[PDB]
């Protein structure tokens, strides 16, 4: 039994809510919050910019040290860093950015990173400004993630569309 509230159950292990992931993280303080990162961990906009802003830029400072040491992530890859004031850990996951020309088949690989963690608060990878079909992303999520995932969808109209079209 945990502290997530108001989530709609989609499957045995996937739950969904129309919510700002930052506000959910502040309220729940989960073990793992997922960031929709890019390979450079440059947290400018979207989920990443919003999470980083809520950490007072500490996420960016930590991320720059990570990249200076290790180089960039792969599309489809991830790294575990601090969750700062928002969570114990942040799992930075790189879904493909279709607007940048990245391979949509890598979305499944991106979601596979979630399976290394028992419970996650996460956004809908590759949706919105990353340019992929969000209905497809939700289907890949449900068909790939086996651990317990609480999805926070920011856009209200999108949430309603995802629920109403879910198979
Ligand atoms: O509208 C949506 O859900 C899709 C969108 N999500 C957000 O931008 C978002 N989600 C939750 N809390 C948030 N707080 C501030 C922004 C924000 C998105 C776009 C690309 C990759 C993703 F993984 C998710």
UniProtKB/Swiss-Prot annotation:
Q: What is the effect of changing residue 164 to L?
A: In strain: Gamma/P.1
Catalysed transformations (reactions): Thiol-dependent hydrolysis of ester, thioester, amide, peptide and isopeptide bonds formed by the C-terminal Gly of ubiquitin (a 76-residue protein attached to proteins as an intracellular targeting signal)
Recorded topology in the membrane: Multi-pass membrane protein
Ranges where the Macro domain occurs: 1-167
Cellular compartments annotated? Host endoplasmic reticulum membrane
Briefly describe activity regulation. Inhibited in vitro by GRL-0617.
Briefly state the protein's biological role.
Answer: Responsible for the cleavages located at the N-terminus of the replicase polyprotein. Participates together with nsp4 in the assembly of virally-induced cytoplasmic double-membrane vesicles necessary for viral replication. Antagonizes innate immune induction of type I interferon by blocking the phosphorylation, dimerization and subsequent nuclear translocation of host IRF3. Also prevents host NF-kappa-B signaling. In addition, PL-PRO possesses a deubiquitinating/deISGylating activity and processes both 'Lys-48'- and 'Lys-63'-linked polyubiquitin chains from cellular substrates.
- How would you summarize the oligomeric state and partners of this protein? May form homohexamers. Interacts with N protein.
What is the protein name stated in its UniProt record? Answer: Papain-like protease nsp3
What is the protein's species of origin?
Severe acute respiratory syndrome coronavirus 2
Q: Which gene encodes it?
A: rep
